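pipeline/complex-builder :: batch 7 item 3
reading input block
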Amino acid sequence: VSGLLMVLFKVMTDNRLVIVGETTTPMSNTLSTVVNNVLRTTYHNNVGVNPALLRDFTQVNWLNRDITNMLQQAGTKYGLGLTETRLDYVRLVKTIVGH
Amino acid sequence: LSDDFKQISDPKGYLTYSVKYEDQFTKKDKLRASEADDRIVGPTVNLFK
Amino acid sequence: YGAAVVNIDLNRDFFDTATGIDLTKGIPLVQDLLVPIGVTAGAEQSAEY
Amino acid sequence: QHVDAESIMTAPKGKLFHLQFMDGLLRPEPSAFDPPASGEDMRLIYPLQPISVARSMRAIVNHNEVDRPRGAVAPSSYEMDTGTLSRNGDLLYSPVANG
Amino acid sequence: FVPDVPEGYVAVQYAHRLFSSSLANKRNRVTYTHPPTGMAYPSPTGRPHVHMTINERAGMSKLVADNIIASVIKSNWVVDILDIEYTAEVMTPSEGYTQHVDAESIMTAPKGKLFHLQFMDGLLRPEPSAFDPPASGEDMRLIYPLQP
Amino acid sequence: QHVDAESIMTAPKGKLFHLQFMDGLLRPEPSAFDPPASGEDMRLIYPLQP
Amino acid sequence: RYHESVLEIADIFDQADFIQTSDAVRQLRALMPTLSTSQIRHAIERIAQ
């Protein structure tokens, strides 16, 4: 219980404020197309893991077939930010951005 | 007027993926594709190896 | 006599390295124009064309 | 680690036991000609509830005889729906349908 | 010279779903299944003629790449790798081939890297001496252009 | 011992070759999950008789 | 049942004062990778260099 409390506490105080970190804008030609559809211009160099990335890369065929089936469903779509972008009304420079 | 926040660059989530391997069927060698694709897909392909 | 081939290349002497072109293989190749940002571009990249 | 039934029976309430559990799905198959082993493996203690409640995936491995190993677990579709940021800043899964 | 794909060949888009592991005569062979019939062919030998196009070599595993090439040889598969981009020096017969491309390098060169291939124009090659010894074995060739 | 086809073709009559032959009935079965081996075993020479 | 094709503005506008280029620029652009604004700035600074 105490554990959960501190977890709940630590989440209660996660005052972290994200700043864009080290990134990459790979040239479109260098990316295998299945990866390229997932990607959106830039991305953080600290790509986390995500199973959607195994698509057409894992050798375990049933896994790739299943993940491909899920990612081809209309109800779900994997992506890698950046996505949303918001410039200042006056300076015209980018400010907040989704990722 | 306040140190209201704590700026950080590449945020770490609360959850994560643990993964136990069956060492008899796993090759410990790091796998890779083209370096561009490996930069992205790489960490994942290595976790669910 | 004995000229196995007679090609029409771009003039290396005109499109010199001062222009940043490299006509050593058949195509023009200019490094560091269209490049990935934030990682070093690979050598012999097709984008150079 | 092995939990003696003695301790399971005689411990004070509030001790937190640490049961282990083999997942035998990937146990190697015996040679077709090898002579039988003597002895019988026996489990004495069991869960009352499902134990692997955190199992994202299982058996990321190929099988010769069958298209997928029995009891292999594919990642959930929700694991991969990058979704969207709602204007209110709450996260949303991708819509299951238009409208 | 781009060789014509012969008459009996069946076009097959490459896909990971095709090649797979399977038990086959006490071995874990990299079986290929042929979509027109669905039949499995664990050995590269004995496979049906296949004009296998290969749009992307992305996740293609080395066992599979090598197994495909083995099908190109042992079974006369004609594979067409459209992912490749290359410059092509054209050699005179006297300068021969300064470079030497392994099959593995063509099946693993990063996408977007420029390959550099060499091609003989052996038209300027003089007739063999009438008493030059017979050549018992054959001269074979695997890499061909897809375009002029 | 391996008998090169060169010697099989070019030897004088009366040489006595010593062919070997695996009896593969007791070959071990591969693990159900193990990844495929690369390469193909090939026999070139065969008996005409049992 | 259609045929996609480039169509130069010169074949529709009659007045030559307001037409500069041809289909060629479109072709060469089709040769280009998708470009981030940062990448574009890179190409520009490189052409300056």
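note: Helices of chain E lie at 62-74, 103-106.
queue -> next item
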